[PDB]
Ligand binder design. Sequence first.
Ligand SMILES: N[C@@H]1[C@@H](O)[C@H](O)[C@@H](CO)O[C@H]1O
Ligand SMILES: N[C@@H]1[C@@H](O)[C@H](O)[C@@H](CO)O[C@H]1O
Ligand SMILES: N[C@@H]1[C@@H](O)[C@H](O)[C@@H](CO)O[C@H]1O
Length: 364
Amino acid sequence: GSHMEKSPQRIMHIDLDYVYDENLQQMDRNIDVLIQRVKDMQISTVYLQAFADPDGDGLVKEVWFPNRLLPMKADIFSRVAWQLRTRSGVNIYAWMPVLSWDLDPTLTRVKYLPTGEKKAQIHPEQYHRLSPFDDRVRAQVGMLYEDLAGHAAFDGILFHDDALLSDYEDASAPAITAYQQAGFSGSLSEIRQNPEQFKQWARFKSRALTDFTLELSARVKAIRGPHIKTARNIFALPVIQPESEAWFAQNYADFLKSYDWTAIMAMPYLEGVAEKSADQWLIQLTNQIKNIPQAKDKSILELQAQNWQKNGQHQAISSQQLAHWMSLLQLNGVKNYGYYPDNFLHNQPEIDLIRPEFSTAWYP
Ligand SMILES: N[C@@H]1[C@@H](O)[C@H](O)[C@@H](CO)O[C@H]1O
Ligand SMILES: N[C@@H]1[C@@H](O)[C@H](O)[C@@H](CO)O[C@H]1O
Ligand SMILES: N[C@@H]1[C@@H](O)[C@H](O)[C@@H](CO)O[C@H]1O
């Protein structure tokens, strides 16, 4: 069976880390408040965190659903999902990491080759990703997605933005083997700097990530049904500067063909854009999108509602600023959009302030 999605898409991207409370009665009230908040927002879709992320340290150690391989911090994904689907009027996408799982140490990790060093290493300021070139990684991540699919009912999958590789990655042994078997000549350095192979190499890696996600969605669809929608977060640079695929292994046209929804992280401050230049940056982004026929109809522009800091103390973005950006998108012909993150505990962003620009059901 199939499942239609009413135009336009308006998305809340929601973490469960602060919904969780070790006091069961408090967690009950938290969930009730969250369900009511999404209901009142009157939008179309929630991208719902299925994994725990208490530290923001780029590695999933625990999840919100029972499963074979990782600790379950609390059984709350299915509980929140079915109530959002029936009380709050939204489709639910299970938001899952693709690679950043704290599994068996013998499983291959993604590594990069540091300039001037012989041995590959793990990049300190990147997601702690397992290698998609390790068959056992593919198997075990497959088991996690199947465990999710078997325990919970939902409408789609959002594949995490951790499915990325730089131009010095993946330097792990299984990755080297894969390149060699795919006909690439020499070391990673020689490939990376080979005029006749470096672009083909970037595309090989982009496709390997994409094919891996499609393996996962097939496994979920086998259990839940064919109606399950797919979405994947894409970084903005591969959209506005496609040569940057070389150090993201993400390709916008590929996403548009492969997934139901391409969730662009339309986040200027994340990309280092000055406050006074953010609107123009977003305008340029929408221009690039509109220049690709039908791209906007399969893309979601995900705005940021926090300004993340290296030292961990993230700075909020005002509801006014967020509503302003939503209006900017609308006025530039983009109707599918959303934001991350949400904070029910402080009504941030403020329901009453963003609904006019966010909810299609809103009236004066
Ligand atoms: N523009 C640079 C690339 O030139 C470089 O190769 C890459 C390395 O990861 O990072 C980018 O910021
Ligand atoms: N912090 C990420 C990096 O992955 C990347 O270096 C940067 C440049 O595009 O975009 C950000 O979202
Ligand atoms: N910089 C972090 C990353 O986890 C991610 O790339 C992005 C998601 O929206 O923003 C923050 O959460």
